[PDB]
Design a protein around this ligand. Structure first.
Ligand SMILES: C#C[C@@H](O)c1ccccc1
Length: 175
């Protein structure tokens, strides 16, 4: 690894990670599951009604957006969504002990998974959680690859799974 490569881990964090997995869009769009989304993976609603999604957007941003936001607004909403995912893990009696047992990079993958799926969805992955606590990284990754989360939308989930296998940032290199 070159001096520069050893620097790459100092450049990666949860925000850079989810920015790569979710992308950055300033106008309402439908995600791989057809749900209305904006900014950096902010799901607006599961409703098929774009009017509901615009309604949620104006609530979330606090102004009349008509389906469009700024980069700074995207970043603020993203920061809030990351904070909610971390808070959701830390207050949960099932997820917290597993999170605490993980190294820093796998902790980012855990916050990413919760950002994407929500607390109850993730907390239902009983086998994977046990595998992760037991440092069975290959098995955890194979099991995550059986999930509907990954299989319905592999490009958004694949790097998180690789990160659970390896505990490094390699999946985020060389975009
Ligand atoms: C299952 C799983 C992992 O994404 C995870 C592990 C610990 C806390 C939250 C999520």
């Amino acid at each position: 690894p070159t001096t520069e490569n050893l620097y790459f881990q100092g450049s990666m964090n949860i925000f850079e990670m989810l920015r790569i997995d979710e992308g950055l869009r300033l106008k309402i769009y439908k995600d791989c599951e057809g749900y209305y989304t904006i900014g950096i993976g902010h799901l607006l609603t599961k409703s098929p009604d774009l009017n509901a999604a615009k309604s949620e957007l104006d609530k979330a941003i606090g102004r009349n957006c008509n389906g469009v936001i700024t980069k700074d607004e995207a970043e603020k909403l993203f920061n809030q969504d990351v904070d909610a995912a971390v808070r959701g893990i830390l207050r949960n009696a099932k997820l917290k002990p597993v999170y605490d047992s993980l190294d820093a990079v796998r902790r980012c993958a855990a916050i990413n998974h919760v950002f994407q799926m929500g607390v109850t969805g993730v907390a239902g992955f009983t086998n994977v959680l046990r595998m992760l606590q037991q440092k069975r990284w290959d098995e955890a990754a194979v099991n995550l690859a059986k999930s509907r989360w990954y299989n319905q939308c592999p490009d958004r989930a694949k790097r998180v799974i690789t990160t659970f296998r390896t505990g490094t940032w390699d999946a985020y290199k060389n975009l």
